[PDB]
Ligand binder design. Sequence first.
Ligand SMILES: Nc1ncnc2c1ncn2[C@@H]1O[C@H](COP(=O)(O)OP(=O)(O)OC[C@H]2O[C@H](O)[C@H](O)[C@@H]2O)[C@@H](O)[C@H]1O
Length: 375
Amino acid sequence: KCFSRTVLAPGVVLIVQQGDLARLPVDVVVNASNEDLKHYGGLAAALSKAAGPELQADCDQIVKREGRLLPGNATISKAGKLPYHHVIHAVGPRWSGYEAPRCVYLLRRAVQLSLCLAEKYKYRSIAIPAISSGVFGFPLGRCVETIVSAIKENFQFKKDGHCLKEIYLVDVSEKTVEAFAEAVKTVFKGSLVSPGGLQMLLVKEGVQNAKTDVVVNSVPLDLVLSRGPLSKSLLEKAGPELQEELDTVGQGVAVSMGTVLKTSSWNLDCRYVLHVVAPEWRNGSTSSLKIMEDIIRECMEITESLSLKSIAFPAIGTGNLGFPKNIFAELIISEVFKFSSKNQLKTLQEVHFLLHPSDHENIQAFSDEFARRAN
Ligand SMILES: Nc1ncnc2c1ncn2[C@@H]1O[C@H](COP(=O)(O)OP(=O)(O)OC[C@H]2O[C@H](O)[C@H](O)[C@@H]2O)[C@@H](O)[C@H]1O
């Protein structure tokens, strides 16, 4: 039983249907999974059954070679006896009344990530169930608006290249599908304040011209500052004494992934510069998403321990490391929120976002997200 049919964009159509994810006319289906890729209850169990042990087997090996996933994550496995080659496994969040927005955030990261994945393997049709709604507790109303919002933003934010044409939104119960069809109906000043007081300023200057107490740079494993365009602009403006200081502070240290080192500002108008070695997008890896949230937390954390009052973040990793810009905007914003609410800060009160005037995708990404957050 089909319900509605909606156009997103030329060639692309969103279809709410009733049906069984096991037997559907699409390239790939999305599984509501957990952190271990274990499929012991729910639909994922329905899927495992039909697929046979092959389905679990690959998962098990995926979990032993890449390790457990975390909420807000998605990977891709063999399908076994299913009418597909692959299943996309989306690990949605567990639902908590207190951490609502972070839950909304992670449910949506999962959906976004799973669209990325299907797009990577060039699929042109996908089936998505109401992830999280079952045994992870996510109230059916918010769950499905979030999924639909996620999908909208996928085609709204960058039209530039897309393999997907058919997105099915599925379930076997009639009410979940009613939700979905209601959800689709509903779905179709750069300055926020978190609960605990700290505010985030959208700012459209070169990072070199920033005037905060702390500024973050993104830099490679051997710490040369001349390579990336962000690093280059700081190097140029500060003086070469920043390269000399950085190489000397990172002397006795086996520079790894998620490494943060502090230097003084020289020519620059800030007091200190935090230099950070950000992870490659690696296709949206679990690691990449941890390590980056961690850097973000550490730089704010450090800053509170220096008793400083303000810090300037650029779109780190959205250049050569290949982070889809929207995903990042929304990664760092969540993290500033999550962090501010959970701590009682004494001196940190202002996170600025420095976006090059000529970087419209980054200006765009952060605006849209700021708009949602003020909405
Ligand atoms: N002057 C500026 N002011 C503000 N933003 C800027 C500026 N210049 C560039 N951006 C934005 O800055 C963003 C980041 O661009 P990238 O410099 O590649 O850093 P990355 O974090 O992607 O990683 C690449 C580096 O790290 C790796 O180890 C590589 O070896 C490189 O050294 C882009 O969105 C720019 O639009």
